[model samples]
Target: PIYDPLAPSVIADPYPFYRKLRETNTVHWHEFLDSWVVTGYAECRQVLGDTTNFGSDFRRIDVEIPDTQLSVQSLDPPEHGAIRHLLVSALHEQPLSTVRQQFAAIAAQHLAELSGQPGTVDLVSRFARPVALRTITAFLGVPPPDGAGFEQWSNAIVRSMDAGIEPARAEPGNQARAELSRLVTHWLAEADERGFVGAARRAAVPAAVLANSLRAVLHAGYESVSRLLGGVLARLVRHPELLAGPATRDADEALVDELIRLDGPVQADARVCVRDQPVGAQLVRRGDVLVLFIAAANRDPAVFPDPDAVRLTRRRGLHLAFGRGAHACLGAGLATLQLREVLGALRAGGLRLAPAGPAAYEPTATLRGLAELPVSVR
Candidate 1:
């Protein structure tokens, strides 16, 4: 059966569709998407691991930046190594405990603001988005202006990240890129000796590379993590029992992992085959695009028993929620810390989710997240 992610039914609840694909033919080519969709757990790991045959440089669209200026996810081997090391070093300079403390403080501030609001509140905008935006901005050493539209820029850019889409579909993202580029450029120009940006400046990294890296990190840090945070809150609201009892850091961490596996922000990731290779039964050709369904892979019955059910105590390997291999999320630690802090603060505040209305999801192909989560605090 051909899969069309854009189809409304699939978009609404893709898990059932993913289950079908994973159970039947693991690797099926979709006529509509004109690409191989790999749904099996092992197959995704294979694709992500064998970067020698499967390349990640699939972006070839006309937008704000030149293809040559592409960094991080698009690069391979030595170049990828050098740039990734620099980013990693910068990130590690801030100790994990320090990052965790910062996240807790930021989350507490947002939660306090939410508590002050009257009536029903859209937690998406009021809480999750701001927390993510502020954290990422602080991490990058940029001061988020009051009422800065960081979420808007992130949404616009990520909405069009999928390749082979129509140019018209990418227009909004291009415009966003321009705005983000301008903002980052200004920051780089006037950046003093402080934080990550200033650190990069002192290190003498190329301006274009630095700016692009910052843009990439900001978009990644803001978009997916915000959605994940919202999803976590939404789930916890539905099952208030999860929020009950004495909350410990370990328990909170476990809950975050379970929820991420069950309802992660990223549904699918694409990679271009660099050489002809057999993935499972399918012989993938060079230049062929393999769309790995991470949402499905995380729920493989073989890997995770009762895959559909969320078990906070369930122990498992590193899931595809943050992706895998060389391109795995660099901000994984920071994201985990932020979520833990948010959960802790929410638990401590004794706020309960009073249902204001049914939850709604944004129309996105690759990402799965709420458009707005209307819930009032009690």
Candidate 2:
């Protein structure tokens, strides 16, 4: 059970297990997962960098699945390049100055409301989720997603990503997917040119790809950002010293990156060997499923010295939190900008966030995040 995602200890803290596996077996086969688990920073990069030999879309090998499933993240090379270009171009349609201001306004508004609450408040519900929900929905120029509920659908979809280990997640995940997809389709049709939908529409992205990419970006933007806010805020609450330093956008951006590098919401990414190739010490056969542990690799000592120690202002290389190469996070700039503003909001408001009780993490394995973070703001 070298890579038991279901284990309670692993859920709470998988890094120790990840460290052991990386040290002893850089690229080991996990029987339960029936995949090659590559944990070392170098090996993980080897796969991420070589899209020629690795594939993010499972349909590459599973011919039974249709192309309708392909999105910016799954498609390879020429196809991926085209869609990725459109999405990236669409994102830049509005200058980040406007986007940062928009998100910062949302963060301030929500944080102020939470500040008025007495005693312990679940930041996940009170501040993090609401801010993220409002910001992302507003950015997309879509109404609040209330069909199956945003939290329900997003969590289920995230949980479904690790259906490799938990079979029960597949059905719920599918339900969430279909519902959200329908919701996205409806939103985009009536969507205007103010936010993401507008820019994407102007770019003339294909309907199916547009829907899938919108769904992907919305979920990634909302879920990943919300989860990141909760987890990173929890870290700050526990260690106020982390916030004792400068709060300039530059400093804060560095702080945010450092925090994400250590405790980002995403845990692992799945890839398939498109062709036979050697990764790390093992020769991966064609179509072999390879689970790249980005979280584990982020903390690899070989790349990041004193991996657990926080250095807020270090001129460090980029971590794998948003991934690298072709499939790097599309919302990376927006996320970092939002985080910078968040840290700025805290400082500007002269607010201090202290943990009121023990924090709790979600049961999800791949996108690990705090389910609840009780905090008191003063």
For every candidate, C-alpha RMSD to the true structure in Å: 2.7, 1.6
Q: Which lDDT tens digits does candidate 1 get at residues 148-219?
A: 466677777777765344445588888888888888788888866556667666655455666788778877
Point out where model 2 deviates above 4 Å: none
* Clashes in predicted model 2: 0
For candidate 1, give the lDDT. Answer: 0.78
Question: Which prediction has the highest lDDT against the true structure?
Answer: 2
TM-score of each: 0.92, 0.96
* Residue 238 displacement in candidate 2 (angstroms): 0.5
Model 2 per-residue lDDT tens digits across residues 192-258: 7788888888886457787898898888988899988988888888888878787666777778879
